[PDB]
Ligand binder design. Structure first.
Ligand SMILES: *C(=O)[C@@H](NC(=O)/C(=N\OC(C)(C)C(=O)O)c1csc(N)n1)[C@H](C)NS(=O)(=O)O
Length: 361
């Protein structure tokens, strides 16, 4: 039976109540899409100290959910015939000399299968003069297409390279090409002076903290957004037909296309999918630092496989003071946006995201 807001309210309240409680979270913003209808919930505060609560306009740092944007942005550019996954990395950054790079294409970067590019850029690399040196001296652990090693410095470099052709900086392309078309008027990279009053404080050992500047920050973990906006983003990704821009639409279709298989999990652009129906255990345990962050053997699906409605699309993200999670089942038109201003364990988030959902399918 078609759940009623109050039965929906029951599940969500039932689940999140105790989470915040035991994970010691200050404020939370969660959204459920139940039969493609948005239902919003918000608990606690955005600012402990200045006693301001979690609003449906409150801005949360998305950490690595930022990557979904990067991947769709790259997909739009692909559709426009501006870039090609197969394109040599050199093509976009000729200055970047050194034979370690010759067989490394845009797919490698996008999908973290270049040869073990690190999870983060040595923050002693705080300028672009230094980002090239870094990449100039990098030493691959494995030949391309061998292992899969989640990394900011990988996809981060894709984002930055993928907008080269267009002549816009990343922030500008992002805005113009994805954010404006979708009407994400509350989704920022550089939060205006005007919006600072809606920008939550992330908590870390009781300290209020905002994500610091960082080479490739924007492209891998620097997008700020609100649960209203996150829900529209999920809605658009969960079904692209609604998208009027031809290129942005295809782009979304591209980022949810399957490029590699890493045992039961498939890799798109930013987005990671699983065949549905899915084993709670697979995704609750595959989300663990120990699997998620490990170098694993990947099976090249090339030509890529096409976005199928019976998949479990999703993406996790963290930042000092922030924990974020997004999941959606295209086929069932269900989704969930969980935004918290305190970083907590991944599989916690993911198991919570499952309890609810499970209850609504
Ligand atoms: C994305 O959320 C991403 N996070 C990072 O790369 C950073 N921190 O996360 C861990 C816990 C791994 C870290 O200490 O580095 C990060 C970037 S800016 C900031 N304040 N933290 C990770 C690696 N992927 S996720 O989707 O599994 O969280």
């Amino acid at each position: 039976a078609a759940k009623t807001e109050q039965q929906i309210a029951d599940i969500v309240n039932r689940t999140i109540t105790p989470l915040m409680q035991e994970q010691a979270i200050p404020g939370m913003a969660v959204a459920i899409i139940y039969q493609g209808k948005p239902y919003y919930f918000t608990w606690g505060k955005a600012d402990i100290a200045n006693n301001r609560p979690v609003t449906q306009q409150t801005l949360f740092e998305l950490g690595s959910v930022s990557k979904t944007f990067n991947g769709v942005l790259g997909g739009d550019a692909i559709a426009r015939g501006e870039i090609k996954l197969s394109d040599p990395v050199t093509q976009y950054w000729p200055e970047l000399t050194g034979k370690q790079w010759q067989g490394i294409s845009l797919l490698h970067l996008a999908t973290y299968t270049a040869g073990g590019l690190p999870l983060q850029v040595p923050d002693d690399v705080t300028d672009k003069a230094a980002l090239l040196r870094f990449y100039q001296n990098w030493q691959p652990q494995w030949a391309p297409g061998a292992k899969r090693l989640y990394a900011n410095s990988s996809i981060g470099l894709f984002g930055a390279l993928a907008v080269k052709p267009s002549g816009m900086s990343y922030e500008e392309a992002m805005s113009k090409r994805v954010l404006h078309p979708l009407k994400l008027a509350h989704t920022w990279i550089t939060v205006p002076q005007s919006e600072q009053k809606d920008y939550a404080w992330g908590y870390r050992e009781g300290k209020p903290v905002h994500v610091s500047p960082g080479q490739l920050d924007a492209e891998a973990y620097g997008v700020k957004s609100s649960v209203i906006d996150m829900t529209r983003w999920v809605q658009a990704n969960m079904d692209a037909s609604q998208v009027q821009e031809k290129t942005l639409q295809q782009g979304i279709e591209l980022a949810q296309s399957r490029y590699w298989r890493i045992g039961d999990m498939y890799q798109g652009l930013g987005w990671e999918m699983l065949n549905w129906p899915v084993k709670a255990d697979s995704i609750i345990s595959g989300s663990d630092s120990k699997v998620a962050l490990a170098a694993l053997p990947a099976v090249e699906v090339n030509p890529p496989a096409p976005a199928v409605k019976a998949s479990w699309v999703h993406k996790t993200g963290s930042t000092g003071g922030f924990g974020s999670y997004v999941a959606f089942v295209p086929e069932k038109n269900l989704g969930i946006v969980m935004l918290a201003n305190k970083s907590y364990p991944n599989p916690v988030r993911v198991e919570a995201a499952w309890r609810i959902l499970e209850k609504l399918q």
